[PDB]
């Protein structure tokens, strides 16, 4: 399957079939977070997807081609996390991002908590463009989880 859209990433190496993450198929390239696959090859029916680019520090990886997602959060508007939780239907959650302030600049962040196997779920703007992937973040004072809006470079 090469149809554009959001996909679950599954494994049969553990008990039963386990969802280890999520990813985005766009322009013939599969995009996910590095910690989901660890850079391993993936299967799509009879087809094989080989890693093309990856970076542990950005925590991103692309398959079949270079990273294609280049839209960015505008810093003002609400966005939607298209959450694909393990065993559950894809669901859109609208939110106003917070900010991660770092020594190298600011990044948007979403304060939404889902099972770890939801990592790789896309965050979208009002045009339906993917502005980043959910799943690399921190646990704050409250004990709640906050994910960076992680985007690659096209």
């Amino acid at each position: 399957e090469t149809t554009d859209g959001v996909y679950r990433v599954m494994t049969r190496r553990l008990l039963g079939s386990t969802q280890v993450g999520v990813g985005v198929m766009q322009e013939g390239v599969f995009h996910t977070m590095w910690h989901v696959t660890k850079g391993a090859a993936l299967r799509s029916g009879e087809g094989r997807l080989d890693p093309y680019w990856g970076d542990v520090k950005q925590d991103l990886v692309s398959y079949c081609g270079p990273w294609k997602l280049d839209a960015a959060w505008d810093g003002l508007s609400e966005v939607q996390l298209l959450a694909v939780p393990p065993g559950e239907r894809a669901k859109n959650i609208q939110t106003l991002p917070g900010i991660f302030k770092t020594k190298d600049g600011d990044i948007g962040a979403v304060a939404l908590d889902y099972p770890a196997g939801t990592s790789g779920s896309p965050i979208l703007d009002k045009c339906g463009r993917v502005i980043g992937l959910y799943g690399n973040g921190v646990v704050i004072k409250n004990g709640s989880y906050v994910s960076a809006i992680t985007q690659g470079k096209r």
Binding site: V6, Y7, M10, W34, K57, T95, L96, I99, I140
Partner: protein
Amino acid sequence: DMYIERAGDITWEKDAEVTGNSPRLDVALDESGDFSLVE
């Protein structure tokens, strides 16, 4: 062995559930790709 399964289209949903706060946090990103809170 890992495999992918389609889960949906990527579209904005009008009248989606609205939730989550917007915290401003000072953070650090290490060479292993881990974020940590700076205080």
